[PDB]
A = this chain, B = another copy of it.
Amino acid sequence: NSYYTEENHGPFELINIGPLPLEEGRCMPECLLAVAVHGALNADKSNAILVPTWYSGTSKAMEQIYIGEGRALDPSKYCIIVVNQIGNGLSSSASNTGGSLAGPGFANVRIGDDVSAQHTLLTEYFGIESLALVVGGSMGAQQTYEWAVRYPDFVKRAAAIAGTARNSEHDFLFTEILIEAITTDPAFQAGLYRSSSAVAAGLERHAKLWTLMGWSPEFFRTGRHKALGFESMQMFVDGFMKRYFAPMDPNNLLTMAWKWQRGDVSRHTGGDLAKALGRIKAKTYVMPISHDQFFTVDDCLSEQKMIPNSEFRPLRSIDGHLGLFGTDAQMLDQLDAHLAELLSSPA
């Protein structure tokens, strides 16, 4: 109630896209998307770039790290549109919706529902017929693939950073343990808690589990956490990891976790992944992180070989998956060089 505000996540505007029928059967009476727009559209509206948010992240995280005038995502050249996930606290979520969708009563939202909402937003409010580039990380990458598969003609270029088209079984288990880290807390009360802080024990265990998988063994072996200003592992868990998840809402995290678990573009073909990825007509750069523990390089390489006219351009960083937070300046330089080449490539 105090963390998901405009004082720490602004600027963004709320847009009502209307009723949204979800894949799981339930129908949201009204769906609100928190949107952050940087840069202006040109005459024919051909310089639009779509940027989805990742797990537990907002539009503020993306703009502070990747969006800038000296960056590949240049607002002086492109109209970068950052859409917050449904269930991340800023958009329509369990923490801000009333009625029978309040708290644990919030419906099961899938990746396809996010893209469906974003497609309505771009057409009914912006009047955009095509996207120059769709770029996202982790869960944002899952939405990137869904976009490129569901609306192949709509997407000119695609950039998936540290994310897969179909969520693996090993990654599924990881998220399941992440969920149980919270639901094992008696203070959770099946989502009927009166304070996200009350569920501190679940959130702290949630943070420690991310410490184990979010980075890499080489990250802590070389003392990278010490170079960030933390004298030890114990202090890194508290001062960085626990600090991050503490003011967040358990229900929202479970909402995004459920969606993360079932990220799969092959549902549009009935499980056939190769047939689904073959539908992609956009110029796609598959960019996994070298030391990612659950979104491994071999996973993404396996999927890239199914995408026509794509390129496998992995990022080198020992910071692992959570290198997306901009802890590695060198990794960002690699990303800028890749995206610039992508945006320079014809469509």
A residues with CB within 8 A of B: 168-170, 172-174, 176-177, 180, 184, 186, 205, 208-209, 211-213, 217-218, 220-221, 232-234, 237, 293-294, 296, 298-299, 302
Chain A contact surface mostly: helix
B298 touching A170 by the CB < 8 A rule? no
Which chain B residue has the least Cβ–Cβ distance from A297? B217
* In contact, A173 and B221 (Cβ under 8 angstroms): no
B contact residues around A184 at 8 Å (CB): 184, 205
Cα distance A113–B211 in the bound complex, in angstroms: 31
Question: Is the Cβ of B298 less than 8 Å from the Cβ of A217?
Answer: yes
Inter-chain contact B177/A237, CB cutoff 8 Å: no
Question: Nearest CB to that of A236 among chain B residues?
Answer: B169
- Minimum CB–CB distance from A300 to chain B (whole Å) comes to 11
- Identify which of B169, B170, B174, B211 contacts A173 (C-beta below 8 A): B211
Residue of B whose beta carbon sits closest to that of A209: B177
A186 to B205, CA, bound (A): 16
A205 x B221 contact (CB < 8 A): no
- Contacting pair A168 B220 (CB below 8 A): yes
A174 near B233: Cβ-Cβ < 8 Å: no
For the complex, give the distance between the alpha carbons of A218 and B293 in Å. 11
Are A221 and B302 in touch, CB under 8 angstroms? yes
CB pair B208 A176 closer than 8 Å? yes
- A208 near B298 with CB under 8 A, answer no
Q: Is the CB of B294 within 8 A of A173?
A: no
A221 touches B180 (CB 8 A): no
Evaluate contact between B173 and A208: CB separation under 8 angstroms: yes
Q: Are B221 and A170 in contact (CB under 8 A)?
A: yes
- 6 smallest CB-CB distances across A and B, nearest first, come from A169-B233, A184-B184, A217-B296, A170-B220, A170-B217, A169-B220
Q: What is the distance, in angstroms, from A221's C-beta to the closest C-beta of chain B?
A: 6
State A173–B169 Cα separation when bound (angstroms).
24
Partner of A169, one of B232, B293, B294: B232
Chain B nearest CB, measured from A165 CB (Å): 14
Instruction: Give the CA-CA distance A173 to B232 in the complex, in Å.
Output: 12
Contact in complex: A217, B172 (CB < 8 Å): no
Cβ contact within 8 Å between B211 and A298: no
Q: Do B208 and A177 touch across chains, with their CB atoms under 8 A apart?
A: yes
- How many Å lie between the Cα of A168 and that of B216 in the bound state? 13
A233 and B173 contacting across the interface, CB-CB below 8 Å: yes
Give the shortest distance, in Å, between A170 (CB) and chain B (any CB): 5
Closest-CB distance, A61 to chain B (whole angstroms) = 25
Question: In the bound complex, do residue B176 and residue A221 qualify as a contact, i.e. CB atoms below 8 Å apart?
Answer: no
